[PDB]
Amino acid sequence: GELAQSIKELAKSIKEEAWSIKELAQSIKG
Amino acid sequence: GELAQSIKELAKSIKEEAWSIKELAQSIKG
Amino acid sequence: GELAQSIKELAKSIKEEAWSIKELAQSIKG
Amino acid sequence: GELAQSIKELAKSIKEEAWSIKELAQSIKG
Amino acid sequence: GELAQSIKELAKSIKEEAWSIKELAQSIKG
Amino acid sequence: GELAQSIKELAKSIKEEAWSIKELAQSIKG
Amino acid sequence: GELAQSIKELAKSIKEEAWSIKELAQSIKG
């Protein structure tokens, strides 16, 4: 139910953050 | 409940800990 | 009882973390 | 019992993390 | 059940984030 | 039992993360 | 059971993240 759903939303947000951090790394890189 | 009664706030705090990321993931792109 | 109380404490801590991540987002954005 | 105790320990650790993220925000802001 | 699954998804996302943070560190390094 | 133990392990890892974030804060401040 | 296992996986991932954040701190410090 709602708890599991919330944790899935959190997991999704952290994936988005991971993607942004990768983009920041790529922008610093050559 | 709170966490996402208690579990319920838990869902609230875990969901809200999810928004909070969407704004980081996002602040780092810009 | 004690279990419900512990989960309420957890929910509170996750809200504090959400607030800090919001602050981190704002500091990056500024 | 032990479960409630473990969740209290988890809540404490998350508060520590929230404090560290706030400190990271302050260091970026300064 | 669904709860365990959600936590597994969270664990996966955090590993991705850890990898991205490592990449950001490598890009800063030199 | 095993559940409480797992949550204690999770609490430990989150403390280590909080320590690293504190170190990141100190490195930015310096 | 599977829940405890999932939480153990989460704990491991957060340790990996702590290590990466430490590496990011080291790269900023250098």
Numbering used by the authors:
A (entry chain G), B (entry chain A), C (entry chain B), D (entry chain C), E (entry chain F), F (entry chain D), ...: 1 to 30
Give the exact sentences the study uses for this entry:
CCs are quaternary structures comprising two or more α-helices supercoiled around each other with cyclic (Cn) or dihedral (Dn) symmetry. Here, we describe variants with all combinations of the aliphatic residues, Ile, Leu and Val, at a and d to give four classes of peptide: the ββ class, with a and d = Ile or Val; Lβ, a = Leu and d = Ile or Val; βL, a = Ile or Val and d = Leu; and LL, a = d = Leu. Peptides are named systematically appending the one-letter code for the amino acids at the a and d sites to “CC-Type2-“; e.g., CC-Hept becomes CC-Type2-LI. In summary, solution-phase data and X-ray crystal structures demonstrate conclusively that different classes of Type-2 coiled-coil (CC) peptides—i.e., based on abcdefg repeats with predominantly hydrophobic residues at a, d, e and g—adopt a range of distinct states.
To explore this switch between assembling open α-helical barrels and collapsed CCs, we tested if examples of some of the latter could be opened by introducing polar residues into the hydrophobic repeats of βL and LL sequences. Specifically, we mutated the centremost Leu at d (position 17) to Glu to give CC-Type2-IL-Sg-L17E and CC-Type2-LL-L17E. However, unlike the parents, they had accessible thermal unfolding transitions. Both transitions were pH dependent with stabilities increasing sharply below pH 6–7. Neither of the L17E peptides bound DPH, but both sequestered its cationic derivative trimethyl-ammonium DPH (TMA-DPH) with μM affinities suggesting that the barrel states are accessible. Thus, L17E expands the collapsed hexamer of CC-Type2-IL to include a seventh helix and to reveal an accessible central channel. The experiments and calculations for CC-Type2-IL-Sg-L17E were similar; although, as expected for an open barrel, for a given charge state the macroscopic pKa values were lower than for the collapsed structure of CC-Type2-LL-L17E. For CC-Type2-IL-Sg-L17E, the central cavity was hydrated throughout the simulation. Thus, both the IL and LL backgrounds can switch and open to access barrel states. Moreover, this state appears to be more accessible to IL, fitting our contention that β-branched residues at a and d promote the α-helical-barrel state.
